[PDB]
Design a protein around this nucleic acid. Structure first.
Lengths: 50, 114
RNA sequence: CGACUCUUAGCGGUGGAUCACUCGGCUCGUGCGUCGAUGAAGAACGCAGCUAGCUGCGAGAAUUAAUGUGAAUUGCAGGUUGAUCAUCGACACUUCGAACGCACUUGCGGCCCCGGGUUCCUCCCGGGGCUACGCCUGUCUGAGCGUCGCU
RNA sequence: CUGCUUCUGGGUCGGGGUUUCGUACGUAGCAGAGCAGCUGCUGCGAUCUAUUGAAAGUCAGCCCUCGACACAAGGGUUUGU
RNA sequence: CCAAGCGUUGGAUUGUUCACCCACUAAUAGGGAACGUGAGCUGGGUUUAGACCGUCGUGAGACAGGUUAGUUUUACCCUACU
RNA sequence: UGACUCUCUUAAGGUAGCCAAAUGCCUCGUCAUCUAAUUAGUGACGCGCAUGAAUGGAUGAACGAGAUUCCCACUGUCCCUACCUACUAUCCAGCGAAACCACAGCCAAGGGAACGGGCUUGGCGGAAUCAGCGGGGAAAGAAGACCCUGUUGAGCUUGACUC
RNA sequence: CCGCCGCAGGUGCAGAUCUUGGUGGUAGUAGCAAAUAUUCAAACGAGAACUUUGAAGGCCGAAGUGGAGAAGGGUUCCAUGUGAACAGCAGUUGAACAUGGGUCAGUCGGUCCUGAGAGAUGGGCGAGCGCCGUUCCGAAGGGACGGGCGAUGGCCUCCGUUGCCCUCAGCCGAUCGAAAGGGAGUCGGGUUCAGAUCCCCGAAUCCGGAGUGGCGGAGAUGGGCGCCGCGAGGCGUCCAGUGCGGUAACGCGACCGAUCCCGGAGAAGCCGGCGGGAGCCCCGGGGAGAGUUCUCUUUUCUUUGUGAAGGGCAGGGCGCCCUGGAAUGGGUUCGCCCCGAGAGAGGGGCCCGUGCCUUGGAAAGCGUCGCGGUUCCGGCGGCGUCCGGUGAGCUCUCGCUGGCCCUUGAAAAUCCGGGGGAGAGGGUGUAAAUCUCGCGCCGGGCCGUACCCAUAUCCGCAGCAGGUCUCCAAGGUGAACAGCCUCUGGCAUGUUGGAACAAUGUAGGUAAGGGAAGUCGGCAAGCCGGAUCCGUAACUUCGGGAUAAGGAUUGGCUCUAAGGGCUGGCAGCCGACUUAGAACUGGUGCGGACCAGGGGAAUCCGACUGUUUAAUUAAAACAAAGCAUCGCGAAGGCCCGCGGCGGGUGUUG
RNA sequence: UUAGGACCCGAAAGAUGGUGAACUAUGCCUGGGCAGGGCGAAGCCAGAGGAAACUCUGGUGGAGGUCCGUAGCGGUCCUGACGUGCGAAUCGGUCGUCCGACCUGGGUAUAGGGGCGAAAGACUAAUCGAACCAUCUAGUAGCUGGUUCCCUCCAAAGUUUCCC
RNA sequence: AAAUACCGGCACGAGACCGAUAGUCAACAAGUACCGUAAGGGAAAGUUGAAAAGAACUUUGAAGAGAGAGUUCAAGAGGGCG
């Protein structure tokens, strides 16, 4: 809700910064196997737990 | 016609969440969250159905701010007991304490003939 | 003549079989046989010039010191008196956790000691160290018409 | 199922005819329960009467125009004993 | 007897097929087609779960014995027909 | 018929009442009523298969999305259907599933696991389709919830057996 | 990679409603049909039925499709770019994607408190992890006023921080438990692309603190005496001073005081009637700007500010107080109710004032009309922001008063007043201790704060016709928060368009004559329906039945009469709505839409109201009052637990 | 031929230890909420008629598990719509109740042979005549279904006796 | 003490074992994504080439997509590509 706890707001803060795509210099590496970010987490589709 | 919202998070019509209509210098009506209606002290006697005189009827944690004279009347049992039940107990204190002496003097004058 | 439909073949699709590979398993065998109040396992949240994950690490944070090694790291920039790698013995190691001041809100203190607000001066501010339970040995302090003792 | 120039043909609009409803708005009145306001003239008044079988709609799948107004000899795809 | 061309109905009570009856009629004949016909309907009756009564059973329960409430799904395929 | 009387069964023998009732097998009970006609309803009648007194009997205003019968009014429920309207269906641009499916898909009889799309014997048979439609495919659905069997269970019961 | 000779096996598939993956026919088919609706130009752009802007037409119609929140979501917020995928048509659009941005508090919440409850310790139990238990089988207090003996800081001044020990202490359970209970104190205007009671500006306010207290005022500067001097004043002494006024209710700005004790506030339900004050609506004018003006309209529409905290005044309230003594009883309400326990009448007192006036404050806001800085602006200016009336109006709020209960409607933190009077203070002064009085100084940490809050940010796998807690609530019609229509605000028809107008549907209608003949059955539909005036049966538990049944009436217009305030049996002025009677009048139409009971005679069952099988059964079932049994006097009845000096009924009898 | 998972797939079950009252059932705690009308209980007032006892009359008042009826809460009939749905229970019309045995949000208590139940074996997270999760477990099955190369040679039984 | 046990742990060695539907659930960012309130349930997914030499340039298109050109033994290997 609007009314959050510091532990929950910290939990949500982490799950925002994990929800960004790959840098496009990562796929130019030598032992590169990553196409896209498989763990991208949309807010309609998957509801984050809690 | 002006329909206007709650200003706090509390979206329920509880005794805490009570408002009044207030026209601002912006020429608009907005909710000011009213204080509760304080009660004057009821008598310490316990036969007076009404509440005391000369004491401010105000919410009880405000009493720190109030001057001494706003919280009592200048009398014996001031702001604690009503004038009626004090002056009936000035009588009751007296006429009992007299009646003690009436049986005190009779005690020796009921003994002394034996 | 057709279109359409079927069969076969050529080619092209759809699809991912087959084969060939294999820094993975599985199984047997061997040597060792080591966690923790000096804060474990586990969890949380951070940490990269450009970084989401994985891995790595802890406000010294994809590491510090020392040692060995001897010129890289590398996706892209940028900057031998030891680059970098392994090794790892020195140091450091945020929050929760047996989890320890009391609560689990990151909510409240208690006490001692430092530095600002000063002009030890009591509030205030920051810092620092203690402040859990059960228990052993001793220590201190008082308890009892406990058993006595002497005055 | 039809139409797309006999110097004519369909279309559209107009007008007729037909027909549906029932008398339009404005205007006028010594019509109107009255009431208000001015000393009989003047407001308000549903309604009524006249103008007024008036007004309005009427082929979109009604009928006749010969009156305006354009438009109409074009495009596309195929077909041989 | 040749004979199925053509008709064979409207209703009261009944869930009823059956039956009885009123009234008409030329006549109110009998049947079949998965006891025609539920992706045609209806769901009155039977035949779930709820309930009541009677008899039966110590009881749970039983009862072609009454009673009441009770989800009726799909065609756009192929044929047939239109 | 049996107020009266005796007897039997381990106790009493259904009293007041109510009834073919939500309770009556026979049964569409018999009589009256309602109708032109009533296996319905109501009112009676009780030898009541198998009614009955807190396993409560009888009643009863008010009440009821409870179950019934009748009357008035109103009506397309019907005689007997018709028209209109809106959204569909329909056709089109764009998008675009599913169930189901041995192969499949025209009949008559025959025989056959005794009701065939295929077999036999006759009828016959003409591309590709559209909108409908419910005759058939013993159509789809879901390893019959009926029934029976299993030395398969579970819920419940008790005077089963063992605790 | 394989032949031959041996060796070994997880060694050969069409099936198992086989397992996993892939692809067909059906099929460019079903479908994209819930809540009335779109249309015209233009813009950007490769591209428009869908975007945006404008104009039109509509809808939601204040119990909303509106403006805000709580749960939950967690970046969905905002801007800019993108058009691959996704948004079941499309897209220049988006809650998609990609880059950046965004949540500011002593005052709003959390924090604090306790509620039902949860739960350590001691104790008990238990093979044991543990369980029970929460005041019970407990040495359960680490606090303060006083006194020597000492250490200390400032001229150790005499006091602060203490050390050692005397005297005082119960209130009885650690801790947890509410973002809706309790709970001190912040408001106005402006500002952002997205944040404001949080930022900026301006007004306050609360709490805590102060070490030699920063100053004032209070305390608290009196009364007798013996001298000079026209007189005042004078110089000395005694004693006094923890404030004053009012008959009172109680008032004045302070007005000493401890352990202790008492009390109050916090802190009490639902409902009815009536009143006071706001907000809104309404009525009559005046401005300012618009809209209409073919005609009529002194027109219709919009707009016409003043916060918190002070102070004063209304106006409410009083179960406060004095006079006096009341019957011929009187005062008084809508109802009541009140009185020799003190009424009427008179005179005061208190409390609340959210109203008004005033500081705030016009400087700001808004309305307008006009000038600049082209843009950098809380830009500089001018005019106004007015005068009143109504009310069973609606909403909130305050008060008074009654009803209701075999119902009696929270606790604690925190805060205050009193009762006592142990102490304390100074000896006429530079007076003291002391002050709940006026000002002054400093400080207020931590966490949450964006947005959606529902026919698209939540939960039902989805932008799912489901579900999901509240606040505000305009005008007309009307009994109405009904329905219908409109304003403010919102929207684009609910995941698509176009063209037709077949059958069959689905959702609305209407039907001549008959009228239930249909059918299991009046199922569905239809009739009836509002108000006023008459009239109303059986039965009845006398309450009902009952809007029984059955009639008459209803529009528009135009009058008549009746019902009231207010100033000096009558004049003067202001009425605000309703009722009745009447005339006239239409093609008998009038509750014109909307809203809105078919009725009667019986039977069966259950008294009734209530509850029930979420998702096939709303019933006659269940419950229920009433009635009647049965147990039990506590070492008990009934019941729970593995256990216990265990637990429920039981804060019981 | 056996015992073992024992050729492969398959029960209904049983036991053990855990997770659930975000739905719903019930108790508790603390909050919120409910137009406008009809009927007119006691109390009360005045008047009338009578000798009191008293009997009336018209007002007043505003009672009730009272009635019509909105929101709310429910869910009757159409056995309507829908039935590869908007929806693993919805839609529409018509309906029940709407001051109380009322509706409702948080908080809180009760947990699986247990809970709670105005009682329907109802409800206990789309699960209820014994929830769900993991394990014992590859449980057992006289019962179904399947049981994969070729050629060659031989080739049946459905009867006897005994058997829960 | 020793002989003895050791499907966990830390190192190793090996195999008539499996070869990406196999072998661990997991050869990969696997106890990961996702699901459930929770207990728990629990995946799919290896291969460009020797070397990116990963297709400069020109051209049609709004772009996605092509047409020539080019790289390579090979695009008949064109960034889910033996």
């Amino acid at each position: 809700s609007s009314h959050k706890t510091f532990r929950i707001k910290r939990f949500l803060a982490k799950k925002q910064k994990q929800n960004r795509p790959i840098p496009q210099w990562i796929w130019m590496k030598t032992g590169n196997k990553i196409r896209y970010n498989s763990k991208r987490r949309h807010w309609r589709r998957t509801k984050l737990g809690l | 016609v002006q329909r206007l919202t709650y200003r706090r998070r509390l979206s329920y019509n509880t005794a805490s969440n009570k408002t009044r209509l207030s026209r601002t210098p912006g020429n608009r009506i907005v909710y000011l969250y009213t204080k509760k209606v304080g009660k004057a002290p009821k008598s310490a006697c316990g036969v007076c159905p009404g509440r005391l005189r000369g004491v401010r009827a105000v919410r009880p944690k405000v009493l720190m701010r109030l001057s001494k004279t706003k919280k009592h009347v200048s009398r014996a049992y001031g702001g604690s007991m009503c004038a009626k039940c004090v002056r009936d107990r000035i009588k009751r204190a007296f006429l009992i304490e007299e009646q003690k002496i009436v049986v005190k003097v009779l005690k020796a004058q009921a003994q002394s003939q034996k």
